[PDB]
Structure 1
Amino acid sequence: MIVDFYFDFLSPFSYLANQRLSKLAQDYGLTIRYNAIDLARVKIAIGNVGPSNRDLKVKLDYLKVDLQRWAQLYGIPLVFPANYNSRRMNIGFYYSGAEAQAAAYVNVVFNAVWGEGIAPDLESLPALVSEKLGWDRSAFEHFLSSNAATERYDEQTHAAIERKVFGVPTMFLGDEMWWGNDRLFMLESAMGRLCRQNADLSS
């Protein structure tokens, strides 16, 4: 069973969705196909050019509370980093190879940025993450600045826009798309339905 997951490391609601998705991966062996994309580009593409929720103090004050409520439900910390400059770490995702290492990268980076509040553009973050994953620090840093890396990020962001993705976190199962950590319960219902039909419990 395959779910396509679209996220940007600047997004705290993506941090929450990733935590929940990863527990489904580990608990039930669901296969996640990860896609790091540029939320700014995706918004611009659909004409969503007003002020961002981050720039609207009254609404942001409420979202911080919403985010703590979910973090408490999930039993994880949530700490805002100093900025939302996620480009480097987004691009870095494309260094990862197979599923296990792709998932490990996404988990380590999200935990660093939104679990601990580490700035996503911290100059030493690539080395810190490399040490964690058993990667070659210099190879990784060289990849992050390479033309090929940016091309790959641009390609995936474009493929997302073609798929009618307008925000993050976004999840697809078959032809159904859900946007929001707060729609994973619908994803889970769909997954249960397919598990039942495949077990011959339902037609």
Structure 2
Amino acid sequence: MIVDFYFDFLSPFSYLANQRLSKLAQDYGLTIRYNAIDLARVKIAIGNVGPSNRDLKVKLDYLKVDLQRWAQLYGIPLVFPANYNSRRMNIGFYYSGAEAQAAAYVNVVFNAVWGEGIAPDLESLPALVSEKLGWDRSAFEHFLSSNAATERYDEQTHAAIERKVFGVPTMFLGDEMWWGNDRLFMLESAMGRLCRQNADLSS
């Protein structure tokens, strides 16, 4: 079974969604197709140009509380980084190879930025992540500034916009799209219905 997952490493709701999706992968063998995309571009595409919730202190104050409530439910830390400059690490997702290493990259980067609060534009973060993954630091860093890397990121952002993705985290199963860590329960219910049909427990 396959779920398409759309995220931007600036998003703490995406950090939460990735944690829960990774557990489904490891606990149930769910297959995740990862897509790192530019939230800023998807928002401007659909006309969402007003002040971001990041810039509305009273709402951000509550969202910070919501985020801690979910981190406590999930048993994980959640620490705000000093900035939301996720472009380099989003692009770096496209260096990863097959599924294990794609998931490993997404997990290590989310845990660094939102689990530890490491700024996503820290100059040494590509090297730190390379060391963790067993990658060639110099080759990764060269990939990050290459034209082909930006093109792949732009290609995926555009495809997500064509698919009617307006935010992150966004998940698809079949023709159904959910937006939010707080809609993963509906994706899980749809997966169960498909598990039951396939097992002949349901028509």
TM-score under structure 2 normalisation? 1.00
Distance 1:104 1:66 in 2: 26
- Identity between Structure 1 and Structure 2 (%): 100
Instruction: Name the counterpart of 2:22.
Output: 22
Distance 1:138 1:40 in 2: 28
SS at structure 2 position matched to 1:51:
coil
Distance 1:22 1:73 in 2: 15
- Per-residue CA deviations over 1:72-93 (Å, capped at 9, x if unaligned) read 0000000000000000000000
Q: CA deviation at 1:177?
A: 0.1
Distance 1:158 1:139 in 2: 26
Q: CA deviation at 1:60?
A: 0.2
4+ residue runs over 3 A deviation: none
Q: Which runs of 5+ in 2 are unaligned?
A: none
Q: CA deviation at 1:167?
A: 0.1
SS at structure 1 position matched to 2:202:
coil
Q: CA deviation at 1:152?
A: 0.0
SS at structure 2 position matched to 1:82:
coil
Q: Which runs of 5+ in 1 are unaligned?
A: none
**In the TM superposition, what are the counterparts of 1:1-203 in structure 2 within 5 Å?**
1-203=1-203
Distance 1:132 1:29 in 2: 24
Distance 1:136 1:26 in 2: 27
SS at structure 2 position matched to 1:6:
strand
- Per-residue CA deviations over 1:167-202 (Å, capped at 9, x if unaligned) read 000000000000000000000000000000000000
Aligned-residue CA RMSD in angstroms?
A: 0.2
Matched residues, number: 203
Q: CA deviation at 1:14?
A: 0.1
SS at structure 1 position matched to 2:6:
strand
Distance 2:107 2:147 in 1: 25
- Per-residue CA deviations over 1:41-98 (Å, capped at 9, x if unaligned) read 0000000000000000000000000000000000000000000000000000000000
- Per-residue CA deviations over 1:133-155 (Å, capped at 9, x if unaligned) read 00000000000000000000000
SS at structure 1 position matched to 2:32:
strand
